[PDB]
Amino acid sequence: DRETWGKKVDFLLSVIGFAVDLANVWRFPYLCYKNGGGAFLVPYLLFMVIAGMPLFYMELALGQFNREGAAGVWKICPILKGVGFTVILISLYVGFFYNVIIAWALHYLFSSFTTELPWIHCNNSWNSPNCSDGTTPAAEYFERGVLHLHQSHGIDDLGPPRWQLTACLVLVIVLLYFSLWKGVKTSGKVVWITATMPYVVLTALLLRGVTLPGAIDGIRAYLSVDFYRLCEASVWIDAATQVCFSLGVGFGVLIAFSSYNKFTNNCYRDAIVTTSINSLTSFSSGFVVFSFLGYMAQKHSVPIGDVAKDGPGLIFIIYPEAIATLPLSSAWAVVFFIMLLTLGIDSAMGGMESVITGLIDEFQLLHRHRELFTLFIVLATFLLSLFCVTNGGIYVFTLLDHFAAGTSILFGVLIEAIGVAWFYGVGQFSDDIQQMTGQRPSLYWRLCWKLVSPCFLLFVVVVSIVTFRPPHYGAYIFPDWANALGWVIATSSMAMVPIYAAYKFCSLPGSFREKLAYAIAPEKDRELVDRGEVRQFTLRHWLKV
Numbered sequence: 001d002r003e004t005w006g007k008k009v010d011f012l013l014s015v016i017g018f019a020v021d022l023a024n025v026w027r028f029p030y031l032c033y034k035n036g037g038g039a040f041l042v043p044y045l046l047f048m049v050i051a052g053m054p055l056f057y058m059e060l061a062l063g064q065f066n067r068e069g070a071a072g073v074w075k076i077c078p079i080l081k082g083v084g085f086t087v088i089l090i091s092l093y094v095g096f097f098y099n100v101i102i103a104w105a106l107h108y109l110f111s112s113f114t115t116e117l118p119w120i121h122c123n124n125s126w127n128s129p130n131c132s133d134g135t136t137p138a139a140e141y142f143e144r145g146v147l148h149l150h151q152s153h154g155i156d157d158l159g160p161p162r163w164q165l166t167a168c169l170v171l172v173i174v175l176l177y178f179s180l181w182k183g184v185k186t187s188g189k190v191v192w193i194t195a196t197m198p199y200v201v202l203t204a205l206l207l208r209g210v211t212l213p214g215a216i217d218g219i220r221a222y223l224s225v226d227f228y229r230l231c232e233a234s235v236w237i238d239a240a241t242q243v244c245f246s247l248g249v250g251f252g253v254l255i256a257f258s259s260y261n262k263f264t265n266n267c268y269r270d271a272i273v274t275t276s277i278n279s280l281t282s283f284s285s286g287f288v289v290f291s292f293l294g295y296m297a298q299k300h301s302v303p304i305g306d307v308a309k310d311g312p313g314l315i316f317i318i319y320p321e322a323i324a325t326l327p328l329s330s331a332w333a334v335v336f337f338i339m340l341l342t343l344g345i346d347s348a349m350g351g352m353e354s355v356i357t358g359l360i361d362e363f364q365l366l367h368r369h370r371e372l373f374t375l376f377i378v379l380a381t382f383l384l385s386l387f388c389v390t391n392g393g394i395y396v397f398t399l400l401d402h403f404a405a406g407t408s409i410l411f412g413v414l415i416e417a418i419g420v421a422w423f424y425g426v427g428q429f430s431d432d433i434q435q436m437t438g439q440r441p442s443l444y445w446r447l448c449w450k451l452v453s454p455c456f457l458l459f460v461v462v463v464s465i466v467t468f469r470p471p472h473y474g475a476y477i478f479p480d481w482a483n484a485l486g487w488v489i490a491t492s493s494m495a496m497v498p499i500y501a502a503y504k505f506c507s508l509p510g511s512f513r514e515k516l517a518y519a520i521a522p523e524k525d526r527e528l529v530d531r532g533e534v535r536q537f538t539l540r541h542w543l544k545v
């Protein structure tokens, strides 16, 4: 009685909605433009084929077979149960700050319901004497009339929270609570709108932007192969990092979503379809951004390089600046901000569902008490998200975005891959998959699970640690204690594995050998362990593909 999905289309839509987030539609086209373009697809496709698909398949299959949450699937290796807490903490940390972009989108949407947009000129009370008519009026409106950033001196001078953004945060929190309090029976029908509206808005945006003058010259700059940029060891690193960070792995959301699936459904086809859709969405959406950027560059007589920005300064400054020059600008602004709002609401409920399912599956007291636990979680998230709505909240946002999910997601994914493929065994995993579906994975999948994925993940982790630069916002330089706090957050997320491993080893009874045997063997093999035969205590178990 684990409350399976109402329909199968509810699962696919939920996964697609979680995967497609705000960063999906701007990061990949910019990365393609920077690293050649067209030729950048070769490292991306190679790394994707050899790393991303096997990890997606492994997560889906593990979640579906074990019928539990992120921390409950570790009855196959009891000593490695800390990685579930690690991924839950990562999701909580990301959600602590991902709910402020949606508040900004709500603020802009409410402000766009007028016959004269407030960011078209600088004659208001929030504009400095020097102006473009000197920073542009759009940027001045964004970071001087909305954020009120000019009243802060850094992360050590924050100030009281702003009520105009606190109201939007409250609205977002109320929507999040009422979209998740009854489980997946109601959460699977919400995604019928939020996972399909972005495509409807993007089609109209592309149709409008294609006809703009100079949009073709912005598209040619997007798809122009080089093939001589593959000789530099910066394109491959960027491709590997993008492959690692573009999938939904490392959060525990996929395991939680799969735990509600039927036992005998086919997860291979589902993984293939979801991955194909997620990868095609970014490539397709790259056609609108660069058409608009080419239109703007032709308007200002400047190269596209100086126009193509990144981060929150693109969708809140650059995009609502070309719209104001279009006929019927208010309607276009309204639909654009509706799309922005609906594109990151299903990536914030997926993370919350991951946390809630993972914590409920462990303690049985929080069973049938689903509304109260959800209320407590959303209240805690709202309380801890009040730091980013102050005068200097953009600094806290930048710090959290830099340190919350990075070098820890890769660590958790590598640990879980090692646990699944080495401690448990690829043979047992293949037998379980053959038990669920009707067919056994081939040699390619087992080889990728055992050898290629761990080495790739370890190389990515090492290159992420070695090449590290502190965050910044404009000309501001963060102090030392901010970097110390970021490192403390990252290490606190990552340090769940050793502490739980030590506690588990110390709690078990007996001598060293019995403790080890009960700690590394699956809970389903308890009879064999009691009899005295352990699979892991042999040479042939670790050298088997």
Ligand SMILES: COC(=O)[C@H](c1ccccc1)[C@H]1CCCCN1
Binding pocket: 018, 019, 020, 021, 091, 094, 095, 098, 245, 246, 247, 248, 251, 347, 348, 350, 351, 352, 405
């Ligand atoms: C920094 O924001 C994020 O990484 C997104 C997220 C948002 C809210 C809760 C958890 C994760 C994920 C969505 C899936 C694809 C990878 N990005």
Ligand SMILES: *[C@@H]1O[C@H](CO)[C@@H](O)[C@H](O)[C@H]1NC(C)=O
Binding pocket: 121, 122, 123, 133
């Ligand atoms: C601002 O408004 C005043 C009066 O409405 C006008 O004289 C002035 O030219 C305007 N300046 C700009 C930059 O809009």
Ligand SMILES: *[C@@H]1O[C@H](CO)[C@@H](O)[C@H](O)[C@H]1NC(C)=O
Binding pocket: 128, 129, 130, 134
């Ligand atoms: C623009 O005005 C702001 C506020 O008065 C000031 O801090 C800044 O130095 C000025 N910059 C220029 C280039 O005039």
Ligand SMILES: [Cl-]
Binding pocket: 023, 024, 027, 028, 246, 282
């Ligand atoms: Cl992407």
Ligand code: NA
Binding pocket: 017, 018, 019, 020, 021, 022, 342, 343, 344, 345, 346, 347
């Ligand atoms: Na999303």
Ligand code: NA
Binding pocket: 019, 020, 021, 023, 024, 246, 247, 278
């Ligand atoms: Na993505």
